[PDB]
Amino acid sequence: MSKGPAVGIDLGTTYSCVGVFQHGKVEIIANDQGNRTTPSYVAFTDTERLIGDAAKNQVAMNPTNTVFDAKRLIGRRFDDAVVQSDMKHWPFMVVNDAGRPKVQVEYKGETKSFYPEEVSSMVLTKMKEIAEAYLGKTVTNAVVTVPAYFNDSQRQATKDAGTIAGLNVLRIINEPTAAAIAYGLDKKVGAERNVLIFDLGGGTFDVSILTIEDGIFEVKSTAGDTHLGGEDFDNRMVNHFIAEFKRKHKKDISENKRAVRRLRTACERAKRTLSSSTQASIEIDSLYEGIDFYTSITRARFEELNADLFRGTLDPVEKALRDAKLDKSQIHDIVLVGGSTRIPKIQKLLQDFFNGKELNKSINPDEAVAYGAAVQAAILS
Amino acid sequence: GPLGSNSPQEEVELKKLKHLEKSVEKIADQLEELNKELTGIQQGFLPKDLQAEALCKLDRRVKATIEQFMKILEEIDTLILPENFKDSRLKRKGLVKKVQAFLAECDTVEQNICQ
Numbered sequence A: 001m002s003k004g005p006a007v008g009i010d011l012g013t014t015y016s017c018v019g020v021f022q023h024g025k026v027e028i029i030a031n032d033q034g035n036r037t038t039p040s041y042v043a044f045t046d047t048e049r050l051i052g053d054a055a056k057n058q059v060a061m062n063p064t065n066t067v068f069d070a071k072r073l074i075g076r077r078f079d080d081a082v083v084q085s086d087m088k089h090w091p092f093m094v095v096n097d098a099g100r101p102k103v104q105v106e107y108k109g110e111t112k113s114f115y116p117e118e119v120s121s122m123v124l125t126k127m128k129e130i131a132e133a134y135l136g137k138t139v140t141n142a143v144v145t146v147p148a149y150f151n152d153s154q155r156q157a158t159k160d161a162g163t164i165a166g167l168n169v170l171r172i173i174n175e176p177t178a179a180a181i182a183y184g185l186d187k188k189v190g191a192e193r194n195v196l197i198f199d200l201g202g203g204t205f206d207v208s209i210l211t212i213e214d215g216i217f218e219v220k221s222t223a224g225d226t227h228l229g230g231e232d233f234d235n236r237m238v239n240h241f242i243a244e245f246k247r248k249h250k251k252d253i254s255e256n257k258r259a260v261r262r263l264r265t266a267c268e269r270a271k272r273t274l275s276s277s278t279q280a281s282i283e284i285d286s287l288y289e290g291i292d293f294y295t296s297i298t299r300a301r302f303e304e305l306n307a308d309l310f311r312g313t314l315d316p317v318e319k320a321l322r323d324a325k326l327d328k329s330q331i332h333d334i335v336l337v338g339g340s341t342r343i344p345k346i347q348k349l350l351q352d353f354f355n356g357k358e359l360n361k362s363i364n365p366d367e368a369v370a371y372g373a374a375v376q377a378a379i380l381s
Numbered sequence B: 001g002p003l004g005s006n007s008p009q010e011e012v013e014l015k016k017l018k019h020l021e022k023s024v025e026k027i028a029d030q031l032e033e034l035n036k037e038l039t040g041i042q043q044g045f046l047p048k049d050l051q052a053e054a055l056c057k058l059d060r061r062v063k064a065t066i067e068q069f070m071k072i073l074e075e076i077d078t079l080i081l082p083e084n085f086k087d088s089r090l091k092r093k094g095l096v097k098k099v100q101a102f103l104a105e106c107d108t109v110e111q112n113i114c115q
């Protein structure tokens, strides 16, 4: 294979995305399964190591040896509160190797431990291979993104993951900066610009305030919720349906994992339908004890079941504005990042808070960060 | 609605269900093979330690089979069939029940080995 271009990689907590700027435009590259995002999942099995979609697709079969969320561990100490709080919700074990966390798995019949940058390097190797399979050329150069709140250790651990993956990490840039680059907010005529990046995707909520002057990105403040996303919105619809099934059939389906899974899968799809329609219908035959569950939900009901969670997103916005020492009227641009920002109610809350101000949302929210990293990659190629 | 009102639109839904029926038959064949392999381990000369390993490799394959049947149910669950699509509705119900009868068979295997 000949030498190819530089790529932009968004290394996410649950999903990653790779982009390439070619022929005057950014192209988000689809993986071997045709997916524009790849799960940040690594599976260890008796016979093999699986990455991305292949790892996620066998998580229900092998929960303990399927690693995800390495981004929540990367560059952190074992005793970090985030590490200590997070390991109660992971099915894989996290061990202490002289102050550093390691994920302990069973691989080819043997007990093996891996550092978070080693797990992230396998994910980065996957993104590199996805780019190479599409371009039909070798991919060595990359711009890799990181959250703005990341510390020196976390940034270095991400660069090391790039190095272990055989990548030449040209530049590590902040995710809100990449999002701002995607919309070309640094190229706008006038004085310094205050940009709010509203990032609701991959199980995390991040708000960042940036000031862009003469191309100098400055991160004034960061706020958010470490755990908040689509999975929570899904659960609320699941609770609603379980209660409905109890009222209609006087039966509790909550203890049947398969019934709850069928329902949860249908709810996540209904939630997506509710982003462009005001109603979604669900038909599940023989959901529980031979009972067919045929129902529907309005966008209004979905919004009420999630009112506290949707409204709760403005607290971080208020906190970031107070830390940046800015009034809401001083924000020149608002950018939507992450798949859950496609929810009309979230968009409505944020536009109303910002007094009818138009949101930058034309680029797919899930792809905006990789898109900005790909533009940057082309400028450095 | 009306009788003898078979529509071209319903042919599309029936085609989706027939592909799913075919996928269920292949998964079912894998279940039967696992069943023969189970009897094979039970009626063979594997000592206790190697028998435990063979039953655990079999357990992972039974969990894979269960997952495939669960993915079929989730695919069938994406279907919205109008009440007038009587044939599709009957076929969807029969396929779901057949998959659930196969799942109950997987569970007799899975719960009885490598606990």
Ligand SMILES: COc1cccc2ncnc(N[C@@H]3C[C@H](CO)[C@@H](O)[C@H]3O)c12
Residues within 6 Å of the ligand: A014, A201, A202, A203, A229, A230, A231, A268, A271, A272, A273, A275, A338, A339, A340, A342, A343
């Ligand atoms: C492809 O995703 C979507 C497409 C169209 C509308 C959507 N509305 C809400 N969430 C969506 N996606 C959620 C993003 C989030 C990432 O972890 C998941 O919970 C998705 O369900 C939508």
Ligand SMILES: [Mg+2]
Residues within 6 Å of the ligand: B059, B109, B110, B111, B112, B113, B114, B115
């Ligand atoms: Mg078992």
